[PDB]
Design a protein around this ligand. Structure first.
Ligand SMILES: NC(=O)C1=CN([C@@H]2O[C@H](COP(=O)(O)OP(=O)(O)OC[C@H]3O[C@@H](n4cnc5c(N)ncnc54)[C@H](OP(=O)(O)O)[C@@H]3O)[C@@H](O)[C@H]2O)C=CC1
Ligand SMILES: CCc1nc(N)nc(N)c1C#CCc1cc(OC)cc(-c2cccc3cnccc23)c1
Ligand SMILES: [Cl-]
Ligand SMILES: [Mg+2]
Ligand SMILES: [Mg+2]
Length: 186
């Protein structure tokens, strides 16, 4: 794999989770953005792969697992096989990316999207090579128990705009947020 993508929504206080769910009320269009970004494949016949930690998997509403239109991979050092509904299981990020080269996924995967949680993002953000981080900045503090590792601007640059991504502040349910894209190249 030549490029990885992370996607996350983060409160002002760096929160991403609270009690096995999101810290904020449901933001419909922000979710549709997550869906659009993670689902859209550039290649006919291929789907994107989503990689996530175990608690993130269980934080997805069951009726919606696995995430439709995408290959779902779960990370765990304890499970012996994928959670019911998940397509693949890996013991590490490294192992997950190597799987895409193996005969079963050979030519089935387009883009790879890391979708949390904290430790998965931390490792992915430090992985060699090209990486884009799609970060929704929720412009409010929310009570959280799970947090996003701060972005090291020695490695990442905030892109001023980006094709396919709205630049202006968004608002849903009185909650203001902005979509950001960060990028590192090596
Ligand atoms: N706002 C947002 O964009 C996002 C928010 N969330 C929220 O975050 C919370 C869940 O995230 P979090 O608590 O951090 O947990 P995770 O989803 O990261 O799950 C943690 C578990 O997953 C496995 N795991 C995690 N990292 C790795 C790794 N690098 N390599 C191998 N296995 C790994 C381990 O499982 P094991 O113990 O089996 O080894 C670990 O115990 C929820 O509240 C969820 O709603 C989640 C995603 C995005
Ligand atoms: C959508 C919140 C969000 N935004 C951004 N920018 N990045 C993210 N990683 C996430 C997230 C997340 C976890 C999560 C929680 C959840 O429901 C509580 C649902 C999803 C989810 C993700 C993808 C497709 C889904 C389809 N149907 C229902 C849910 C889907 C995904
Ligand atoms: Cl923006
Ligand atoms: Mg689904
Ligand atoms: Mg809260």
């Amino acid at each position: 794999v030549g490029s990885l993508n992370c996607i996350v929504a983060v409160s002002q206080n760096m929160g991403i989770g609270k009690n096995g769910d999101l810290p904020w009320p449901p933001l419909r269009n922000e979710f549709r953005y997550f869906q659009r970004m993670t689902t859209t494949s550039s290649v006919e016949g291929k789907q994107n792969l989503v990689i996530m930690g175990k608690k993130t998997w269980f934080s997805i509403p069951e009726k919606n697992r696995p995430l439709k239109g995408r290959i779902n991979l779960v990370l765990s050092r304890e499970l012996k096989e994928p959670p019911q509904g998940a397509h693949f299981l890996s013991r590490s990020l490294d192992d997950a990316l190597k799987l895409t080269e193996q005969p079963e996924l050979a030519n089935k995967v387009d883009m790879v999207w890391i979708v949390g949680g904290s430790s998965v993002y931390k490792e992915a953000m430090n992985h060699p090579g090209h990486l884009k981080l799609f970060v929704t900045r929720i412009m409010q503090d929310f009570e959280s128990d799970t947090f996003f590792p701060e972005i090291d601007l020695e490695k990442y640059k905030l892109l001023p705009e980006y094709p396919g991504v709205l630049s202006d502040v968004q608002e849903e349910k009185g909650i203001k947020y902005k979509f950001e894209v960060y990028e590192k190249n090596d």
